[model samples]
Target: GSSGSSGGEPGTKAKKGRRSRTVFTELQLMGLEKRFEKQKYLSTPDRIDLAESLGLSQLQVKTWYQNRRMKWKKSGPSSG
Candidate 1:
């Protein structure tokens, strides 16, 4: 059941969260590695602290860890 009821919001919609491109300096990278060493998974302040201290968005920090774990999974996988 599809209805045609338009025009209910206030202003025009917001923008998209477009493609993000970023590279980390070594210190930033080191910070990530340091955190990652203790935590293979993130905690509450996990990404928040990393973002603030190392100059990155929480999203970026979190994704980098996720990707790093992905690498750990894919590298030399004979665990089948």
Candidate 2:
């Protein structure tokens, strides 16, 4: 049985956890770099497109952007 009509498979949010290290593997960082390389600011549709290109689901893309924005907002841009 399914919890909702969205799909036949079960859906559950990943459990909360402490923040991961800022350092990402080269390949993982490349995915993020490529995404913003296409467009620094992305709308919902743009995110979906990028997610598909990166072989990731829309939710992952959405979450990544959310986290990225929060970080950028906190740190601001570098002078150099």
Candidate 3:
């Protein structure tokens, strides 16, 4: 019983309240951080690997990984 898939109505583009922002919990954050620390990664493969293992959407994990990581204070060498 799903309803939200079709092209029956067409209207001007407008900003209606979209989906709510996902609030990562402490446990979820810990999971993300743990993988982030171990991988120090910036690509596919293990990115979604962790996401799958952690029960998070790959896109969600990718967003965080892409936006942050390595860019802040890190163990790796690089400051610029």
Identify the candidate with maximal lDDT: 1
Name the lDDT value of residue 66 in candidate 3: 53
CA lDDT for candidate 3:
0.71
Over 1-80, each residue of candidate 3 has an lDDT whose tens digit, in order, gives: 98887787675664333346877888888998887777666377777677777788887776676555537555857879
How many clashing pairs does model 3 include? 0
- Residue 45, model 2: lDDT of 89
* Candidate 1, poorest ten consecutive residues by summed lDDT: 13-22
lDDT of 2 by residue, 47-77 (tens): 7776666666676665665666655665547
TM-score of each: 0.60, 0.47, 0.53
* Whole-model lDDT per candidate: 0.77, 0.65, 0.71
Superposition error at 41 for model 1 (Å): 1.3
Candidate 1 lDDT, tens digit per residue, 1-80?
A: 98798868676864443446667889889988988878887677867977898887888766787677867775565777
lDDT of 2: 0.65
Model 1 ranges off by over 4 Å: 1-20, 74-80
